[PDB]
Design a protein around this ligand. Sequence first.
Ligand SMILES: OC[C@H]1O[C@H](O[C@H]2[C@H](O)[C@@H](O)[C@@H](O)O[C@@H]2CO)[C@H](O)[C@@H](O)[C@@H]1O
Ligand code: AU
Ligand code: AU
Ligand code: AU
Ligand code: AU
Ligand code: AU
Ligand code: AU
Ligand code: AU
Ligand code: AU
Ligand code: ZN
Ligand code: ZN
Length: 364
Amino acid sequence: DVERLLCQKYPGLAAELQPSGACIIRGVLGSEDTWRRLKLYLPHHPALHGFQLYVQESLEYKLYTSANLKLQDDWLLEDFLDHLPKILPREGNIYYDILALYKSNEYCLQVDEACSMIRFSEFTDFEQHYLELKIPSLLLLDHSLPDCVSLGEMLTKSAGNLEEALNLFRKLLEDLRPFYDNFMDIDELCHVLQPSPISSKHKTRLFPLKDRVYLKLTIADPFACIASMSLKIIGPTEEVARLRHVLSDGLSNWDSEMNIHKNLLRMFDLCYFPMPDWSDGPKLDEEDNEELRCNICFAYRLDGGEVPLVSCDNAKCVLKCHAVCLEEWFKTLMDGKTFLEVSFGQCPFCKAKLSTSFAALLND
Ligand SMILES: OC[C@H]1O[C@H](O[C@H]2[C@H](O)[C@@H](O)[C@@H](O)O[C@@H]2CO)[C@H](O)[C@@H](O)[C@@H]1O
Ligand SMILES: [Au+]
Ligand SMILES: [Au+]
Ligand SMILES: [Au+]
Ligand SMILES: [Au+]
Ligand SMILES: [Au+]
Ligand SMILES: [Au+]
Ligand SMILES: [Au+]
Ligand SMILES: [Au+]
Ligand SMILES: [Zn+2]
Ligand SMILES: [Zn+2]
């Protein structure tokens, strides 16, 4: 309807309606030699009067009402938009600054040819982390840290010179040690199945709790490590059902003076998590049916390191599956309604109960 006109003529605007018969348009409107950040309130869409335009003049938003700004008596939204852009009214040296930072025991600083970009790395106590900026922009290129962090935004607003940038970054690193430290133990003492290749960026970890039962740890806010912590039990219906109670209790009894790993051991009454060990002897014995490969894709490991973990309650149904290879089945089954309303579906193979706890492997 209106996002139509917004799509063809204004790709940088987002028209959000309200059930309150109103309409808010935010986004960017542009002319050939200028653009503005914009927020337009329209109390009476499609009538313009009573309009409330917020244009970012610099640091703050400037407000335009009918008193502020004068429209035409006949204009519609379109008219108002393609008209709007015309009606609205020591410095130190960076190369020196690089040389200033070049030598240091706390990080190696690398300069690209033509010095178009620089890269900090091998940070002390965070040797895995790195930061790349454009020169002399100081525009954020690549970097470690979960992608959900608004580092770019932080830099532009809070970092004036190269040194200020470096430090803002090392600041977050310190802020992030609890997040990182916490995954330290889980990575070394648990058998982490996904992410296949673990990186400074991943806010997640999936590992086995016991035979047939996986536990997926996920940390929404890397700065609010435990506040944003979240556990999900994945496995056969009854195991899931059973363990879900343990989980609740475990959280209620959370020992704040213990990290997540040890707190999980506490939670599930284990002195250690299941993990491959030389003491398992040589496998061979058992020779799990040669087919551990999905069973739909006929692949074992996907381009993203996904692995066949899905399995019905029926011990006798040899047959596993990548969650994504079954993504629709999981959504066409439990569409909307929560998984306690829908615990399972039918094993498309033996018909057995198939826990919908696996849908948890989706999305991410
Ligand atoms: O007798 C089995 C085994 O128990 C312990 O080994 C554990 C190990 O501590 C963990 O990594 C766990 O995930 O699996 C291993 C095998 O059960 C003992 O430490 C080990 O010496 C012993 O053989
Ligand atoms: Au568009
Ligand atoms: Au709208
Ligand atoms: Au140098
Ligand atoms: Au280096
Ligand atoms: Au984030
Ligand atoms: Au934590
Ligand atoms: Au033990
Ligand atoms: Au359907
Ligand atoms: Zn698959
Ligand atoms: Zn089955």
